[PDB]
């Protein structure tokens, strides 16, 4: 059941990996993976009904 | 001898697993798996000798 993932190596001394085994039945007991996703800011930065083209007049 | 099972993940951050190894000879020493089965309530809720059809008269 071992999970093996790569570290993003900052200061250096191939790919370095690290190993994770979950010891408990409840996902709540688990550490945080920090394997997270980014998303586009659009829902807050561009919430307009008509798609904005930045080279064009915002008002036409 | 490692047993690998899936967790039912509640709050999220594929399938997450967890690992179990029994360290002792006596099954009594083991943790609880919590891998349990449900059953129908019938033996307490419907203990009648003749099968009940709910749309029909219970007495006929």
């Amino acid at each position: 059941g071992a999970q093996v993932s790569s570290q993003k190596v900052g200061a250096h001394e191939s790919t370095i990996n690290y190993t994770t085994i979950n010891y408990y039945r409840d996902s709540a007991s688990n550490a945080a993976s920090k394997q997270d996703f980014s998303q586009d800011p659009s829902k807050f930065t561009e919430p307009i009904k008509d798609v904005l083209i930045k080279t064009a007049p915002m008002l036409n | 001898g490692a047993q690998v099972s899936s967790q039912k993940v509640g709050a999220h951050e594929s399938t997450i697993n967890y690992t179990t190894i029994n360290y002792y000879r006596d099954s009594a020493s083991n943790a609880a798996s919590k891998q349990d089965f449900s059953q129908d309530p019938s033996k307490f809720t419907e203990p009648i000798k003749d099968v009940l059809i709910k749309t029909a008269p219970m007495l006929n």
Binding site: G1, A2, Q3, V4, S5, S6, N17, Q35 | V4
Partner: peptide
């Protein structure tokens, strides 16, 4: 056994 990410 192993999962590799």
């Amino acid at each position: 056994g192993s999962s590799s990410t």
